Design a protein around this nucleic acid. Structure first.
Ligand SMILES: [K+]
Ligand SMILES: [K+]
Ligand SMILES: [K+]
Ligand SMILES: [K+]
Ligand SMILES: [K+]
Ligand SMILES: [K+]
Ligand SMILES: [K+]
Ligand SMILES: [K+]
Ligand SMILES: [K+]
Ligand SMILES: [Mg+2]
Ligand SMILES: [Mg+2]
Ligand SMILES: [Mg+2]
Ligand SMILES: [Mg+2]
Ligand SMILES: [Mg+2]
Ligand SMILES: [Mg+2]
Ligand SMILES: [Mg+2]
Ligand SMILES: [Mg+2]
Ligand SMILES: [Mg+2]
Ligand SMILES: [Mg+2]
Ligand SMILES: [Mg+2]
Ligand SMILES: [Mg+2]
Ligand SMILES: [Mg+2]
Ligand SMILES: [Mg+2]
Ligand SMILES: [Mg+2]
Ligand SMILES: [Mg+2]
Ligand SMILES: [Mg+2]
Ligand SMILES: [Mg+2]
Ligand SMILES: [Mg+2]
Ligand SMILES: [Mg+2]
Ligand SMILES: [Mg+2]
Ligand SMILES: [Mg+2]
Ligand SMILES: [Mg+2]
Ligand SMILES: [Mg+2]
Ligand SMILES: [Mg+2]
Ligand SMILES: [Mg+2]
Ligand SMILES: [Mg+2]
Ligand SMILES: [Mg+2]
Ligand SMILES: [Mg+2]
Ligand SMILES: [Mg+2]
Ligand SMILES: [Zn+2]
Lengths: 205, 384, 91, 50
RNA sequence: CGCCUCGACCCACGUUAGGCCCAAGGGCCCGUG
RNA sequence: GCUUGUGGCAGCCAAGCGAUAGCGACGUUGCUUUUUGAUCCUUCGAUGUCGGCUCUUCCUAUCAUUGUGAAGCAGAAUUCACCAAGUGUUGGAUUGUUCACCCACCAAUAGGGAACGUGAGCUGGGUUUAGACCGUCGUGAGACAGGUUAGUUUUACCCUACUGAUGACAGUGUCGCGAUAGUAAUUCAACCUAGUACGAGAGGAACCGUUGAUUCACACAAUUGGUCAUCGCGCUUGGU
RNA sequence: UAAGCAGAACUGGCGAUGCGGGAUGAACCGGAAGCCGGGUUACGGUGCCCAACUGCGCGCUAACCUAGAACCCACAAAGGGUGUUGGUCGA
């Protein structure tokens, strides 16, 4: 796996319904290559194996702790965005200055906070669950695992996300009216300059 | 190898680290859950520990050997004059937790509370809130105040009042700097809370608006400091034999060869006392209201005219002239220490919770010795 | 066998109150699941009849009643007291 | 208890099979145990009667 | 909250045993000095 | 450290006992490293060798306590098994013990690891220097893994770890948020249930409720108790 | 009984030896070497750490035991399963 090569200012990835370790693998390569990646909706990342297998995996991780000073030992983050942050860190040479810089280019969020609610959010085809998992096999959502092990901001995330989807639904209705107006405009402008646009006919889709 | 005999460990690991508190005034770490059906009310109060005395009462408790018999009980007196509301603070929800939305302050703030904003009040020009007070004079300024309040009603999910004590009423405290705290309003809708807290600006809220007799409350404060202390007193470990070379007031083994480190669970010497503590389920036996018969230490069975203050004053405190609470048992901290009183976080559906207290006698003998008189009048009539 | 089980329907249909099971002082309360009705039957001595539209919800409510009346710490081959489904059908 | 109601109560307390490994209580027509810890054993015996 | 010494162009929710589709493999932009 | 014969623990078959409630011979498969051996890899310009006291963590092959399944489970009691290491597992006589064995209490008095945890923590009763008895052995000097009695226990101010204490990090102060880390409560009794369920009888439960207590933790000093150089007051010896 | 035990036969190796792989390691696999440029391989690999496919193709597996996943090598047995998938011999 190499980088995207798309050389933008920052790519915003909609993490919903992606496989956690396959998403973290691609993002880690992007960060190591110099790209800034913003991951939103980390509460809806999917992990293969249902809730039960994933929950006991975290409980075994929660067992690990420095016997003589626990505040020194492993830090067990409960939020979905910090869980994904730590999964990515495991795939990065983070004790070197290069990996330190790579991990500083990653931003992870639960829900879609501003300004990314009004930007374009992409998907990773080879991390999507619909292309990665057989339809009958078990899986769980990151927010469900996080809620089971101590995360307490699932309700505020859900309430904010409903408000965001209402605003986006209204913006979608407005965009559909402007699209119908556009199609009428290109129809009327088609005849008004009918002769000039003959070269565009064979490549019209 | 395993230890030869079992005994439980000395001290609790749940109060770690045993350090000095970072604050002096006790802090509410969790307010009661808001029930929007109930009327708007405050959930906490500030008071000052005056002293201890003992009361006698007849117990009504079926099934107990104390039933219909009198008991002697030690009580703590907390002087609680009314608080002044001087502001409002709003909180909105956020994926990172609660966040302060905005705050609105009253036009008039006493110099006692304004001293809280200064390290050296008498060397300064005392400019705090001098320009903020100008919003209440113009008309554009009043528009901002109303706009801030309307923002509170629309966006806030938690509304808290900013209140301060009238610390100069207790002369024996010898302090002019008031104590300031945020108190949550726990009734009604958000618009109800904002309207309720705004009508209280520059107004005195008495202790009876917050608590009632025979209620279980939680007391928050900082315990008495004791400085550097050894393991025997700080943690309660046992002394070593008299024969012990280099002293006997230590822990003998502070760990095994492996792990090759000292653990956080082993008792060590350090700071003892001056810790933040939240103590719950303290019953209110009496509410002494200034200017009423309930302020006196006379009961229905004892008609002797006497005040709550013991003969010669409360030792190291002074005379209680303001409103006060009588509370069963002991209370955190020394005398004069500011204490935070909070409503119970859980439902008090219990016999001890629901018991009705009827006092038979209040001791007002001097606590500075083996006092034997209840009043100065009785002492002078005895000696001629 | 010895202690007559006393059942009381709380709402019009929603609740049942079991007391004196094996002569105990505990009160067993079972709330019928959504859409399920219960009636202390007539024409039969000690029958309760549960009614509803969903087979899983009616059968689960009968399971709740039976499982709250388990004999503890005794030989249940001898102490056969309980509330047991006697007939399941679709009216 | 009337004999007819006795038969009803024995349908749940008595007419059962017991796993000889994990002691699980099984329906009378069971041939294998329902439990993973005993490996779904076929070594079953009837529940003993009073 | 108070007090002042290198065109970096692009906002749907949701579902894949379903909503013409069958990838932005698109669209927009004097894209021209 | 390797090994696991021996030690300990767990299985498979089923002749029998009373086939598989509970057991289980003749055979046979394993696991473990708190036994003891076997080895001699590390350490001989030295890693302080027994035991106990103190203190903290850890395991589970669970003794009690929570929830259950089984019985040759009527009740009461007991036994087998499961999920379970959250909380407990004590005061003493003899002995240097470890191990043991008795007394007593208890819900119960389970088993173990951490350089056979822990000596710059103690102690020094035992082992094991030099003094000295006895028995046996030796011609003798002397020996004994046999008994007996007397026999100096050093240093931390360094680094880390741990416990607390200040503190910079683009003005200053007040009020806040809360990622993360820690964490805690525990067991028993009395009364009612009830001399009831059960049982031929003898015997004999429990839930709910109520009232207490144990172990632990965190505070506090109204009262009781303790503490004196209040050198506060009094008395008093000798001197001056 | 066994042992990273103790002792022999043939050859190689380490000791005396770097270098690539086996995460790590005297001995295992590859391969032995002056200072360099370019090309290609061995062993071993191609989701990220990590250079190289989330490559093309068929099955099997679902682990509510920490499913499983690189010679030496870092273990597992007798015995079981109406889990599931292939077969064989019969009524
Ligand atoms: K020990
Ligand atoms: K104490
Ligand atoms: K002691
Ligand atoms: K400021
Ligand atoms: K063995
Ligand atoms: K040596
Ligand atoms: K001597
Ligand atoms: K917590
Ligand atoms: K098979
Ligand atoms: Mg690569
Ligand atoms: Mg936590
Ligand atoms: Mg033990
Ligand atoms: Mg809090
Ligand atoms: Mg000494
Ligand atoms: Mg006093
Ligand atoms: Mg019984
Ligand atoms: Mg053996
Ligand atoms: Mg045998
Ligand atoms: Mg040496
Ligand atoms: Mg040493
Ligand atoms: Mg040394
Ligand atoms: Mg177990
Ligand atoms: Mg335990
Ligand atoms: Mg050992
Ligand atoms: Mg040792
Ligand atoms: Mg020493
Ligand atoms: Mg020692
Ligand atoms: Mg030492
Ligand atoms: Mg000695
Ligand atoms: Mg000697
Ligand atoms: Mg001789
Ligand atoms: Mg001696
Ligand atoms: Mg009878
Ligand atoms: Mg040599
Ligand atoms: Mg060499
Ligand atoms: Mg080359
Ligand atoms: Mg693939
Ligand atoms: Mg390896
Ligand atoms: Mg097999
Ligand atoms: Zn079974």
């Amino acid at each position: 796996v190499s980088g995207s090569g798309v050389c933008a200012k920052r790519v915003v990835v909609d993490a919903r319904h992606h496989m956690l370790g396959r998403l973290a693998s691609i993002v880690a390569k992007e960060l190591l290559n110099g790209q800034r990646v913003v991951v939103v909706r980390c509460e809806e990342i999917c992990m293969s194996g249902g809730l039960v297998r994933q929950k006991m995996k975290y409980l075994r991780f929660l067992r690990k702790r420095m016997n003589t000073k626990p505040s020194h030992g492993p830090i067990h983050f409960r939020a979905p965005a910090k869980i994904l942050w730590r999964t990515i860190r495991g795939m990065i040479p983070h004790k070197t200055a290069r990996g330190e810089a790579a991990l500083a280019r990653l931003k992870a969020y639960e829900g879609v906070p501003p300004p990314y609610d009004r930007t374009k959010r992409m998907v990773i085809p080879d991390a999507l669950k619909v292309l990665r998992l057989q339809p009958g096999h078990r899986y769980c959502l990151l927010g469900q695992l996080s809620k089971e092990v101590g995360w307490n901001y699932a309700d505020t995330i859900r309430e904010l996300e409903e408000k965001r989807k209402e605003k986006a639904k209204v913006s979608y209705d407005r965009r559909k009216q402007l699209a119908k107006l556009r199609v009428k405009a290109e129809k009327a402008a088609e005849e008004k300059l009918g002769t000039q646009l003959e070269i565009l006919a064979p490549i019209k889709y | 190898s395993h230890r030869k005999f079992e005994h439980p460990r000395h001290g609790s690991l749940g109060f770690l680290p045993r350090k000095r508190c970072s604050r002096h005034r006790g802090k509410v770490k969790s307010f009661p859950k808001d029930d929007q059906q109930k009327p708007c009310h405050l959930t906490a109060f500030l008071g000052y520990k005056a002293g201890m005395t003992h009361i006698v009462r007849e117990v009504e408790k079926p099934g107990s050997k104390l039933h219909k018999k009198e008991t002697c009980e030690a009580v703590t007196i907390i002087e609680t004059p009314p608080l002044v509301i001087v502001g409002l603070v709003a909180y909105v929800k956020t994926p990172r937790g609660l966040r302060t939305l905005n705050s609105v302050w009253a036009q008039h703030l006493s110099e006692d509370v304004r001293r809280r904003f200064y390290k050296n009040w008498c060397k300064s020009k005392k400019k705090a809130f001098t320009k903020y007070a100008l919003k209440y004079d113009s008309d554009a300024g009043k528009k901002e105040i109303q706009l801030q309040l309307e923002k509170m009603k629309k966006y806030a999910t938690i509304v808290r009042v900013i209140a301060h004590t009238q610390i100069r009423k207790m002369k024996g405290l010898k302090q002019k700097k008031a104590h300031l705290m945020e108190i949550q309003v726990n009734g009604g809708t958000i618009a109800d809370k904002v309207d309720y807290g705004y009508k209280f600006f520059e107004k005195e809220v008495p202790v009876e608006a917050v608590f009632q007799k025979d209620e279980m409350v939680d007391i928050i404060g900082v315990t008495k400091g004791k400085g550097y202390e050894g393991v025997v007193t700080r943690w309660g470990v046992t002394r070593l034999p008299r024969k012990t070379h280099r002293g006997l007031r230590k822990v003998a083994c502070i760990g095994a060869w492996h792990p090759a480190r000292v653990s956080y669970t082993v008792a060590r010497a350090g700071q003892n006392g001056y810790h933040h503590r939240t103590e719950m389920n303290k019953k209110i036996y009496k509410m002494g209201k200034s200017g009423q018969e309930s302020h006196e230490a006379c009961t229905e069975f004892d008609r002797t005219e006497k005040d709550i203050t013991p003969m010669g004053g409360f030792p190291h405190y002074g005379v209680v002239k303001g409103d006060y609470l009588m509370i069963k048992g002991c209370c955190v901290g020394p005398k004069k220490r500011v204490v935070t009183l909070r409503q119970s976080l859980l439902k008090q559906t219990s016999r001890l919770a629901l018991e009705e207290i009827k006092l038979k006698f209040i001791d007002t003998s001097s606590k500075f010795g083996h006092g034997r008189f209840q009043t100065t009048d009785e002492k002078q009539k005895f000696y001629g | 066998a010895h202690f007559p089980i006393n059942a009381s329907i709380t709402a019009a249909n929603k609740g049942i109150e079991i007391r004196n099971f094996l002569g105990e002082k505990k009160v067993r309360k079972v709330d019928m699941l959504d859409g399920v009705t219960i009636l202390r039957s007539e024409k039969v001595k000690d029958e309760i009849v549960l009614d509803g539209n969903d087979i899983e919800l009616v059968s689960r409510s009968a399971a709740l009643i039976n499982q709250k009346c388990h004999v503890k710490n005794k030989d249940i081959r001898k102490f056969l007291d309980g509330i047991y489904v006697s007939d399941k059908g679709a009216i | 208890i009337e004999p007819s109601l006795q038969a009803l109560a024995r349908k749940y307390n008595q007419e059962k099979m017991i796993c000889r490994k994990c002691y699980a209580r099984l329906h009378p027509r069971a041939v294998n145990c329902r439990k993973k810890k005993c490996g779904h054993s076929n070594q079953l015996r009837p529940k003993k009667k009073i």
